[PDB]
């Protein structure tokens, strides 16, 4: 009877840090998948199953819209088979991903004079994430042999670090809102 509400996740006022990424489910609607592809307001619009056109020529069991902010330079890691700090410890697409990644520069909203420190990424983790895993732990990370006994200090690091989004940042270091669409019948073209 009505549109899938992509205005809820795309034009949302606040976005989530990558370590604690948000995920919306999308059911029982129809989604015009070419008012996103023909927008032109998106720096990035890659898909990994089949085409943004034949996608709205199909129905699916359910659709996922994951959202988060990262550095523009890290968007190359939101893709199957990548590595790096974001794909390993924060948000991991599976090797067989069928969906679309969308990204736009957000330097007007998410950057601040003096640095915007509310966006965080996970810097320290002993081992890689599984695909579509969310880790929101803040347990002190033990980098040496001695246990930390719950005290931040040497070899005893808080695992989350801040992107200090300042406006004067070079564009590869500016904030990028990202949305990932997953496809696995409730919504169609």
């Amino acid at each position, epitope marked *: 009877t009505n549109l899938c509400p992509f205005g809820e996740v795309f034009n949302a006022t606040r976005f989530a840090s990558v370590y604690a990424w948000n995920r919306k489910r999308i059911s029982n609607c129809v989604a015009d998948y070419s008012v996103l592809y023909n927008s032109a307001s998106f720096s990035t619009f890659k898909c990994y199953g089949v085409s943004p056109t034949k996608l709205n020529d199909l129905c699916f069991t359910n659709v996922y819209a994951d959202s988060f902010v990262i550095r523009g*330079d890290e968007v190359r890691q939101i893709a199957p088979g990548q590595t790096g700090k974001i794909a*390993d410890y924060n948000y991991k697409l599976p090797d067989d991903f069928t969906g679309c990644v969308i990204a736009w520069n957000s330097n007007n909203l998410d950057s601040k004079v003096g640095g915007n420190y509310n966006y965080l990424y996970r810097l320290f983790r002993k081992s890689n994430l599984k695909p579509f895993e969310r880790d929101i732990s803040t347990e002190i990370y033990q980098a*040496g*042999s001695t246990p930390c006994n719950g005290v931040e200090g*040497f070899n005893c690091y808080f695992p989350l670090q801040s992107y200090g989004f300042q406006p*004067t940042n070079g564009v590869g*270091y500016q904030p990028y809102r990202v949305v990932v669409l997953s496809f696995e019948a409730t919504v169609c073209g």
Partner: antibody, heavy 117, light 107 residues
């Protein structure tokens, strides 16, 4: 207490191969970003290689396809496998623990690789 | 990103205030470190996050800066402070350093 102790450098014929060790104590090598950095005679500091705690590995373009970084957790040691050596690989090589926003805080004393006939 | 230090060589007497700068080409917020390298030795961290003193380093070293202009100050030079000093971009997937500034003690 906390130290990186390297070894393995010396004279090596061009196109040949050589492996450097970096024994750590206090620091657990498998739980850190470990890098290799090198300094050519009279020049600046050039990053070579990094290995993430979770496994991933990255290399500078000048080194891709000839160097391999790895570690033995049972001996808490970092390795740099260097193959197919060139004359611009002559340098002092340093291992160093990288901490992101805090910098590289712990360095080995360095080992000297001299590629010559 | 490319990091440029100035001067490249510099000379000052025991007791002078000394200031080195690092220009970044694109704008790196506070992601900058400073290292000292004595001849024959490995680099020691002095400053991380543009202005934070690393544990153990004497208090006559200090950093200020943000964006593209970073400054390293030695408020009262010591004879042992001749070295080469390097800046470094932090959170850089190339681990970029500056060319180095050689500091000599005037006497």
């Amino acid at each position: 207490e906390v130290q990186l102790v390297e070894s393995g450098g010396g004279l090596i014929q061009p196109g040949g191969s050589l492996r450097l060790s970096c024994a750590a104590s206090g620091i657990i090598v498998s739980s850190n970003y470990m890098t290799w950095v090198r300094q050519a005679p009279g020049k600046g500091l050039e990053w070579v290689s990094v290995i993430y705690s979770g496994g991933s590995t990255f290399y500078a373009d000048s080194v891709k396809g000839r160097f391999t970084i790895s570690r033995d957790n049972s001996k808490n040691t970092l390795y740099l496998q260097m193959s197919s050596l060139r004359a611009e690989d002559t340098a002092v090589y340093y291992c160093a623990r990288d901490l992101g926003p805090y910098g590289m805080d712990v360095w080995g004393q360095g080992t000297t690789v001299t590629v010559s006939s | 990103i490319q990091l440029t230090q100035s001067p490249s060589f510099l000379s000052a007497s025991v007791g002078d205030r000394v200031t080195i700068t690092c220009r970044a080409s694109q704008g790196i917020s506070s992601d900058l470190a400073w290292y000292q390298q004595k001849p024959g030795k490995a680099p020691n961290l002095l400053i991380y996050a543009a202005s934070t003193l690393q544990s153990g380093v004497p208090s006559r070293f200090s950093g200020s800066g943000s964006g593209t202009e970073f400054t390293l100050t030695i408020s009262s030079l010591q004879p042992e402070d001749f070295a080469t000093y390097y800046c470094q971009q932090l959170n850089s997937d190339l681990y970029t350093f500056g060319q180095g500034t050689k500091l000599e003690i005037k006497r």
